[PDB]
Design a protein around this nucleic acid. Structure first.
Ligand SMILES: [Cl-]
Ligand SMILES: [Mn+2]
Length: 175
DNA sequence: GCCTTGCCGGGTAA
DNA sequence: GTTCCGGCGCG
DNA sequence: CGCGCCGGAACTTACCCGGCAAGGC
């Protein structure tokens, strides 16, 4: 479906450059947040937000897309119990993504946490198990890759995509 | 040569 | 990237 | 009383970038 794909992509952005938060305030107040942060307000307004808005319309979510200016980056924020569980449940069923979703999701994760220089093809994350999942999808799409611990200061692993397959990767995934 | 990729420090964009 | 804050709405 | 959407803001740190050098054809 068109929404499952846009969903997979947004989840990549979210995991890569934002998050999902179940907040608890005093006294017994709460909030659920779907967040993507970025340096460029323009990317957020022009590229990311129209995608999220579509998803919101599609799910009859009522919350508004908030764009908040932070000291170091802009934050897209949807304050919504519904949107939150939607993405959170999807994250839990990640291993079952089909090809369409796999691709969309890797695209989102790469845009967010990849080497966009493209001189090398790399993805960074502290979650090894998440990288191992991506690694297998790639291998099965004919894109060889390795994982090792890149940054010993912060426990950040890198998924390195063999440049022998640079073309199949840039073409297949970053479409 | 040249290409690839593991290594590792800077500092800003998460 | 994450979690405080004070606000508000609502059964 | 209990919870869930707003609008920030302060707070922390995980990324991305990019030079180097070892191994391979
Ligand atoms: Cl995971
Ligand atoms: Mn990023």
């Amino acid at each position: 479906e068109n929404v499952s794909g846009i969903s997979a992509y947004l989840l990549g952005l979210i995991i890569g450059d934002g998050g999902l938060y179940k907040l608890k305030y005093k006294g017994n107040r709460s909030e659920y947040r779907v967040v993507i942060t970025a340096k460029s307000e323009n990317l957020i307004k022009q590229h990311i937000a129209p995608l999220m808005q579509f998803l919101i319309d599609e799910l009859n979510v009522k919350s508004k897309i908030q764009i908040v200016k932070g000291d170091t980056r802009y934050e897209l924020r949807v304050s919504s119990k519904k949107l939150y569980y939607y993405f959170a449940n999807m994250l839990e069923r990640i291993r079952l993504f089909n090809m369409r979703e796999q691709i969309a999701f890797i695209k989102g994760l790469y845009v967010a946490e990849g080497d966009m220089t493209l001189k090398r093809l790399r993805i960074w994350n502290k979650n090894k198990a998440l990288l191992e999942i991506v690694s297998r999808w790639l291998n099965n799409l004919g894109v060889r890759n390795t994982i090792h611990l890149d940054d010993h200061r912060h426990g950040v692993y890198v998924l390195n995509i063999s440049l022998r397959d640079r073309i199949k990767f840039v073409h297949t995934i970053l479409s």
